[PDB]
Design a binder for this molecule. Structure first.
Ligand SMILES: Cn1cc(-c2ccc(F)c(CNC(=O)c3cc(Br)ccc3O)c2)cn1
Ligand SMILES: [Zn+2]
Length: 343
C-alpha cells in the first residue's frame, strides 16, 4: 500500500506537467467540427463536453487522446435486436435520410461519410501533418508523429433511457434515489458495432459519478474525508493496461477493455456505499477487494453490465473461459507479488 501510492504519485507527475498535445488536438478537432457542421447530415455534430478536448482512455500513454462527437436524433424509434438487451436497431418517425436502408439506420453508410469528410479536411492543414489510419473508435488520426486522436460519433436522444436500463444503475444506497433520477434525465448515446446495430454509451454518466462520488456531499473536499474511490479505479485500469501491453503480442487479453474494469468497480461502490469503507488510509485493502471482486467475476463468468443488468459482459459466449482463466492467472500472480507490472 506504500507501493501503490508510489504508483499513483508517478501517474500524476505525468498527467500534470506541460505538453503541447492539447493545442495540436484542439486545433484539429475544431477544424473538423466546422467542416462537419458544413454538411447537412452532420449539421448538429458537436463535442460531448466543450472544454474537454482531453479525455485519455489510456492512463499510461498520455499521447493517445479520445474524443466523441454527438449528433442529436429527434424522434428516435429504438428496437432491441435478438433479445440481447444491449444492442438495438435505430429507426425514425430527416437529415440522416441518405443513410437509411428501409426503416433502419445504417452505421456503415454513416461512418463512411463521417470518414470521407474527415479524410478531406485533414489536408487543409499545412500547419500540422495529420494522417488517418484504416480501422479493424470510428476514426483515428495521427497528428505530427507522437499524438493520436480516436474520434467516435454517437447518436444522442433526449428522450428517456431505453426500457432495458430500468432496474439498472442501482446507486440508490450510495449516491441516492434523487440523484439516480437526475442522471436518468440526462440524454443517452448510441454508438455502433455488432447487422447495423447500436449500443448505449454511458461515459457521460460515469464521468459525473466520478466527480461526485461519495455518500457525503463533501467527500474529498477536505482532509478529514479524503477517500480512495478514484485511486482504486486508476489502479484497476493501470493493472489491465499494463497487462494488455505485456501480452499485446499474444491474443489472450484482446477481449478486455477499460470498461470491464469500470463496470466491476462501480459494483463494489454499490456493495460498499459508505465513505467510511474507502478511507484514504485503507487504500491497500480497498484495492485488494476490488482485485478480488474482478477475479470473482472472471471465475464465475458473471459480471452484470452496470446499466443493463440482464446483460453479462463475461458470459461464456462473449468471452471464452480460456482467456478469462488467463486474465485470472496474471492478476492473481501480480497480487501475490505486490504488482511488479506497475514498473
Ligand atoms: C467499450 N465498450 C463498451 C461496450 C458496451 C456494450 C454493451 C453495452 F450495453 C454498453 C453500455 N455501456 C456501459 O455499460 C458503460 C459503462 C460504463 Br462504467 C461507462 C461507459 C459505458 O458506456 C457498453 C462494449 N465495448
Ligand atoms: Zn471521495
Amino acid at each position: 500500500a506504500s507501493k501503490l501510492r508510489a504508483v499513483l504519485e508517478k501517474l500524476k507527475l505525468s498527467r500534470d506537467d506541460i505538453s503541447t498535445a492539447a493545442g495540436m488536438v484542439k486545433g484539429v478537432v475544431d477544424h473538423l467540427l466546422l467542416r462537419l457542421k458544413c454538411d447537412s447530415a452532420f449539421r448538429g455534430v458537436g463535442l460531448l463536453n466543450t472544454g474537454s478536448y482531453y479525455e485519455h482512455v489510456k492512463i499510461s500513454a498520455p499521447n493517445e487522446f479520445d474524443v466523441m462527437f454527438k449528433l442529436e436524433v429527434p424522434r428516435i424509434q429504438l428496437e432491441e435486436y435478438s433479445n440481447t438487451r444491449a444492442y438495438y436497431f435505430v429507426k425514425f418517425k430527416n437529415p440522416l435520410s441518405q443513410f437509411l436502408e428501409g426503416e433502419i439506420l445504417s452505421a456503415s453508410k454513416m461512418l463512411s461519410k463521417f470518414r470521407k469528410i474527415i479524410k478531406e479536411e485533414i489536408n487543409d492543414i499545412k500547419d500540422t501533418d495529420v494522417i488517418m489510419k484504416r480501422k479493424r473508435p470510428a476514426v483515428t488520426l495521427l497528428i505530427s508523429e507522437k499524438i493520436s486522436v480516436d474520434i467516435t460519433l454517437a447518436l444522442e436522444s433526449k428522450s428517456s433511457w431505453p426500457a432495458s436500463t430500468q432496474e439498472g444503475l442501482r446507486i440508490q444506497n450510495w449516491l441516492s434515489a434523487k440523484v439516480r433520477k437526475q442522471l436518468r434525465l440526462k440524454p443517452f448515446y448510441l454508438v455502433p458495432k455488432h447487422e447495423e446495430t447500436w449500443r448505449l454509451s454511458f461515459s457521460h454518466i460515469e464521468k459525473e459519478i466520478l466527480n461526485n462520488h461519495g455518500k457525503s456531499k463533501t467527500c474529498c473536499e477536505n482532509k478529514e474525508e479524503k477517500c480512495c474511490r478514484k485511486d482504486c479505479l486508476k489502479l484497476m485500469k493501470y493493472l489491465l493496461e499494463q497487462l494488455k501491453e505485456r501480452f499485446k503480442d499474444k491474443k489472450h487479453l484482446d477481449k478486455f477493455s477499460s470498461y470491464h474494469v469500470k463496470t466491476a468497480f462501480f459494483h463494489v461502490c454499490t456493495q460498499n456505499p459508505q465513505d467510511s469503507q474507502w478511507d484514504r488510509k485503507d487504500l491497500g485493502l480497498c484495492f485488494d477487494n476490488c482485485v478480488t471482486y474482478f477475479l470473482q467475476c472472471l471465475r464465475t463468468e458473471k459480471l452484470e453490465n452496470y446499466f443493463i443488468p440482464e446483460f453479462n459482459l463475461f458470459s461464456s459466449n462473449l468471452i471464452d473461459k480460456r482467456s478469462k482463466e488467463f486474465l485470472t492467472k496474471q492478476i492473481e500472480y501480480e497480487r501475490n507479488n505486490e504488482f511488479p507490472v506497475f514498473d
